[model samples]
Target: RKAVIGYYFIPTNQINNYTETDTSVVPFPVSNITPAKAKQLTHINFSFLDINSNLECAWDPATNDAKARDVVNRLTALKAHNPSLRIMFSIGGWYYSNDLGVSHANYVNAVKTPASRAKFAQSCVRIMKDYGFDGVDIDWEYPQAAEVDGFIAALQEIRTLLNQQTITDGRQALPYQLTIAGAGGAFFLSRYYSKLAQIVAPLDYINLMTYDLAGPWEKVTNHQAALFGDAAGPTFYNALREANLGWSWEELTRAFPSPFSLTVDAAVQQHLMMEGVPSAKIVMGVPFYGRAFKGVSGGNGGQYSSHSTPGEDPYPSTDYWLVGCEECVRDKDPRIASYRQLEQMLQGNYGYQRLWNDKTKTPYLYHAQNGLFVTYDDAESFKYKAKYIKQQQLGGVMFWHLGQDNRNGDLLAALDRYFNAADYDDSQLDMGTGLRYTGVGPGNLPIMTAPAYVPGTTYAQGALVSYQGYVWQTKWGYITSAPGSDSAWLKVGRVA
Candidate 1:
């Protein structure tokens, strides 16, 4: 079975709010993900649930609760429409960092003790059941090297609790699923390798946040999520040490035992596989957004320019300069650009020329005239990633956000076309004799003899009859008159 999980985040005040009267556009909204999108997703992670004190889960009711409820209600209603869809709550995110304060530590400590861990596990199951969620995803950004044991212990306890709940509720056949949003960094993966591998047996799949491999933090421009590392780019450890000032290149590389390359290939081979995790239990992550850099200098179209800055930076006094038009630099942030914006840039020439990287099988945009660089995944890039997933025998693919794509869901459609293609027969076939089938078209339907309809004979609803060399069915129970007299007789097909 294929699993296409989409992470949905609740909008907060940290970003600009747009409404009916507001002139500014809101790129991400809870309402933007329609029922059609929900049906396509096999799993949806409702990100996120904050860790409050006393083993409770917290979400800001004033801003997030209503939107969360609306999303949950809509997705739940959509579940009735598509039985294959499953929803889960993703607890914690990168925003709630350990350095930020008590949230991360509180979670670690809660699971450190047996009683607190049990309480936390019970709370998790209760929240999932109460909210009508099918599973829970732990997104503790990066558990410290010391806290890895506690993290694994916590997952084990939660899994046990979920199983117990299933047995108690008489749902042995439908046990609660457990998953984790694993760190993409080799540092964390290597640190918690043994424990992560141990917990694999209990979890459904580990979603590797494969993007953010390269960003404004790095001096040189690189693919945010390359399938393979560029030979010209800095070694993975060099890039790692650059982003993390505290770690030395030698020390970091020695500790991780892998070269510093920020490609999906490196992550899976050097990080995940080396640690003994099965590819079948690993879900490849794809980003629906792109990262941009500005003020880059190079005839190479700023492909690997060392001089670049965030587009949002107002002051360009340093090495980084704003090279694009004032509007381009102002409107496009160096942080992230949704696929919608990328699509527009690709279709419309806003001084941006799209480029492809053959080595990585990824796409980027460069405007040499403007010295602007963008690295993002589009439908074409995702098609390549989907093929990689199939070729590697991995679990499936999961993307960051749901509403990041265009109104037509170009990215999602590309993923579906590749991932679900195996279930369909690609060979040509002739349509044999049959009236109708439930799914698709021209499939065999059960043959049934139609009862003869006589004048003044009372026919029941949906009663089929043979009349005038054709198969006809009654729409409602009524005294039979002439076969096409009223709305009663509906033609099924020519009698075979």
Candidate 2:
């Protein structure tokens, strides 16, 4: 099985209104956000319809409601461009939390009362069908606590409804998918995961919200996603400390910048496996936005800053720096160095050296000068993670947004190269004889010859034999052999 790699394209009207001009230039070229970009993407997500609070749909189409029309138009265009592209409408966001004084829990309550939730779910399905979307991704900002029982119940209800719809609709009346986005962390994996695995596994996929491990809100300095370190590393808590402030990891984990320590994502994966969430359902999250770090001085070529006394400059004033998906694509310039150094360090330094953590796995290099700390994942990091996904057999990689990425498409190109290369066969073969087998090919094919082949009938074509687990092949009339004098005949093989 191979891992699927895709990115989310969330265009907050605040950032760029969905005007034809703005929508036309939607930076994330892979999403179906625009008719032209549809062919460029494999999947599409119409970010946000605020299911947590009011089910009225966030984008009001009254007067130039770009969100609403954008979703519909994009989905419509995408379907026309490519019928196979998967489309999902996301709901909920950070502020939707009940604790955040939002109507998220209240919305859940509304759903429990009657078919309100069902109606909403079904309505979303209808809208998706009308707009040509394939499914729905519930991003309930968050749901935690005894009261969140309603949220859990809603998922079950939604799943049931989807199944029912699939049956009555014949999978085409309104073919829809159900998936969820959740926070990343050992505790998160422990909390709602049991219910999630049960409810979400049957769906298409699960997007594990992994980034926001650390950022400006913190009073101290630390990498957003450091590969190595204890709890005090450049993570949520540590970054907060460096920022010279304090925030509850518990609370923040539910919100944006959800930090899953690299160490933690690994531990949590193991824990989830124990709990029965198939590894195939998990998609590691990547961040599109970078966190701004204020204050800091010098240290091990990273950020080093000294906090003043309580009243004296509580948070020091240093150059502000942004680190995340956006900054990385803009600054690192994937085309230049190919970000190979970082990739090498990640692969060699960390056991999962082939993968980079954009969210769940932290990968950042701090700089010392004017106390600037920039934390973000670059193209090299993305490639590493993609390769790791293929190697680990994980479901895939989920990028936050397509807009913030190497304009040259180097990140995906590199991923395609690694993934495409990982599938080739390198298994050694043997052609019984003193000569351990390497491989057989036409005269034009590159061949790694061996010393000699074992005694056997005339060497036949495509026959594989091995001596002491070393491989050899029998081709043509003679047993292929290498010279005994040309240095050490390192065992090698030929592909194709």
Candidate 3:
């Protein structure tokens, strides 16, 4: 399975309460990544459900009226440099409920009416197509549970419309893409996953929100994305299992742990998969930014909070920037220099085990004084997760936002190294022919043939021939398998 690393960007058009200035900048192009690295990116989630309807989120209709258009321009520029990147626009987020303005209130009504729903869906289709986007991600806040009738039904209808377009127009048919960013853990699935999955499972994979396990809202706080234990609580196992997936402990060990727990990501994936949800469909979430806490004396809360000082700048809110807390640089930043020091100290002084949580399935460094806490995935942890992804056969990973990473793109680069290593080596056996067939050899060993090979051709055994840098070994001294059947059969690559 191929690992997919997608980034989500919530581009605001209007200057709203979120931030004083428009954070979403148009004409801002990432123009220097190499072509090889560019292919590693599978999708770009141009978040904007909140801004499309907001009045503040505009650059200049003529210059950048359409967020998708701005995205297209930026992507085009990046492609000019890299040549391989796909873009998608994610609609709706935590803030904007569907029942907002008069028109939005009417949107559900319009959806209820086939004609209006078709019109709205078509408008969305037109916008995405016009901007040269590959598809759209529906991030509807919460479906029918909020007493909003026809919400899930509308999603189903929208999927049908998207598929119809794909059928008739080929690439123009919405590019056969449908994604949904759901609430983290079981409560989310409990509400509408089974029903929702039934609708969009055929389109593509689901992007699970594995983070936000803890927040200030909790009476006692914890980490944001813990790998082991339910950093959000004990419901994590049930939440994942309810989806009906089978995952092994090996897979669980790869994930990033919760902000509070000590387990690693592998443990997280394994636990979830074992509980339920096919390993292939699950895409673990990676925060583009880290969470920050303030004003605590000890415990998981203390480590993060102790770093905070009253007159000093408070933790950097998502409102201002995408990554790192306020004390990150000058004082309590959690990079190699700061957090690592404390982590090592905790591991050494406290007798806390710096190990992976076998039950929760995440990595952590805990102490009696500092308490137990987990970290979001950084480059080092990401490398482990990437390798684990390939090893465990999970679908891949989903990044929170592209804008928050270190400008060098280290996180993405690490992921590329793990996932795209095969693409660069060309070591895997490439079937010259498309068919799958088997043959019995002298020793009764099963031999696989290339679709192109014909019967009765002389072939040599153990002969090395390089077609695409892959040395194929001819089995059984039959160099030529056949004359008329086909030109080539199958080639095998010995794993070094």
Best-performing candidate as measured by lDDT: 1
Worst 10 residues of 2 by lDDT: 430-439
Alpha-carbon RMSD to native, per candidate: 21.6, 17.0, 15.1
* Tens-digit lDDT string for candidate 1 (1-496): 7689999775554222434233245545545556767667889898877777676655643345554555566667767656777888888887664445447666767767778877888888888877788889988877766777777788899988888887888866556789998877665555555455676767889988888888787888888888865666655552322232243333334334434556776565533423346788889899998887877787666778885465333544343232333323535433566787677766765678878887677888887776778888987677667766776788999999876777788888778876776664323322222111111101112344676667777887878787776667776686466676766676554556
In candidate 3, stretches whose alpha carbon ends up further than 4 angstroms from where it belongs are 1-3, 8-10, 13-29, 32-37, 50-68, 77-84, 98-110, 146-149, 167-174, 194-196, 230-279, 299-374, 422-496
Better of 2 and 3 by TM-score: 2
Clashes of 3: 65
**Every candidate's lDDT:** 0.68, 0.47, 0.47
What TM-score should be assigned to candidate 1?
A: 0.74
Q: On a 0 to 100 scale, what is the lDDT of residue 32 in model 1?
A: 59
Q: List model 2 lDDT by residue over 103-179, tens digit each.
A: 55555555564456666666666665565556777776555544355665666666777777777768774366777
TM-score of each: 0.74, 0.61, 0.58
Give the Cα RMSD of candidate 1.
21.6
Tens digits of per-residue lDDT, candidate 3, 1-496, equal 4546466453444212223134233212344334544666776676654323322111223333444454456664554543335676776665454444322443345445556555656666666666666667766555544433455455566577678777777656225576776555554544554344353444465676776665444434345555434423322233323332222232222221222232234233333422234557656676655443333445332333333322222443223211222334433433322232333343354444444433333344433443434334465455545555565566778887665555466667767766766554323422122111111111122234333333454656555443432334453465664321233423343222
Candidate 1 regions with alpha-carbon error over 4 angstroms: 13-31, 61-67, 170-174, 238-260, 271-276, 310-332, 422-496
* Best of the two (1, 3) by TM-score: 1
